[PDB]
């Protein structure tokens, strides 16, 4: 009588779960401005390049118009993204035990309050060093918020709807990007845009007090009283009678009362070590090949609004395709096919002359669908292939190996565009195709109802 059976008897997609998913959807739209937002507000309109300073003629005011970073400190924007991505690295190494042991829901609430305060302080920051440190904190806190929220969603949802609710969460992320574009068009000033982004965070915390904790992680602490309380509250919420308390409670005496995120037992079991290595390779791929592809995309009209509108309308067809095909053939074959398609798209620009009609749109479309389907696979698979005391140690393969991609892709492309114009495409295609062909074949399996039964990490092998 695992908690999934209790949720099934109480209704996995009841009204209470609907409002909880709405609340964390409101959280999801608050994560896009942290990562995607920069291309809008940190965008130089024009540069005059004695010099005698530089003046940009545009009604909007970006970060570089107000800090004068056009020529003397042009690399500061790269330094700014490097500092944000090092914030992601600091989060990946930091919010583990510090994100679980103090109370998972309470940690999420404290961090979302911290994010609100730090964003408001970014709105009123009349310097640069404080701005950089605050962006470090913003990156760390926002990554922690989004991963904790997503894993909480895949914890509440019972077996049979994890794919649906997670893919709807990613659709909410894409809708957050679309709303970012809309609010960007609403007013070009970065200050008011940041202040308007910070208000969904208030709307989150204001109503986030009533959301309960994760029942399974709470059961992992051998505290089943309030766990049974919250399960019966959920059951009575969506018009259902409570189940048997003894069946609902699972003692699981072999489980440690506290958590010990393994820094050395990850490689103890060969299945877990192999899964972690495969996910490391796959994650590196993903942002690697990605910002790579984005960079290789042509100049979109407008370059600040229609660029985002065209980039965001890619995901939603991909999200719907994933929703349709993720269960009929499992969560391995569709994403493997998408990655092979992305590799073939990367390899086709080299041997085919660009003068052919519609070649640019064909390659951009195929690559992008491939590395949207890859991302909406890998997030769900990393969430599924880790128990509750390993999922927060499972964020590191998500974020401590995508951070290296985000840091290093500008340098790799900067060297590649000089050494050989045909070099970066061959490198990206070779690494992506070889990795996604050898790997992503058997990273355990899919369709497993119990991810944190103390035997999920070993029985699948
Ligand atoms: C948010 N960033 C930078 C991504 N990795 N996007 C993506 N799904 N390739």
Author numbering: 2 to 50, 121 to 532
Task: Provide text from the study.
In the case of hOCT1-metformin in DDM micelles, we successfully delineated structures in three conformations: outward open (hOCT1-M1), outward occluded (hOCT1-M2), and inward occluded (hOCT1-M3), at resolutions ranging from 3.8 to 4.1 Å. In its outward open state, the hOCT1 metformin-binding site exposed extracellularly. The channel connecting the extracellular environment to the binding site is negatively charged, potentially enhancing selectivity for positively charged organic cation substrates. Metformin is situated within the central cavity, forming cation-π interaction with Y361 on TM7, with Q362 also likely contributing to substrate binding. Consistent with the findings from 2D classification, the ICH domain densities are exclusive to outward facing conformations, irrespective of hOCT1 complex formation with either metformin or spironolactone. The shift from the outward open to the occluded state is characterized by the movement of the extracellular termini of the CTD helices, with the intracellular portions of these helices exhibiting minimal displacement.
The human organic cation transporter 1 (hOCT1), also known as SLC22A1, is integral to hepatic uptake of structurally diversified endogenous and exogenous organic cations, influencing both metabolism and drug pharmacokinetics. hOCT1 has been implicated in the therapeutic dynamics of many drugs, making interactions with hOCT1 a key consideration in novel drug development and drug–drug interactions. As part of the major facilitator superfamily (MFS), hOCT1 operates on an alternating access mechanism, allowing substrate-binding sites to be exposed alternately to either side of the membrane via transporter conformational changes. Each hOCT1 transport cycle involves transitioning from the outward open to the outward occluded, then inward occluded, and finally the inward open states. The protein can be divided into several different regions, with the N-terminal domain (NTD) comprising transmembrane helices 1–6 (TMs 1–6), and the C-terminal domain (CTD), consisting of transmembrane segments 7–12 (TMs 7-12).
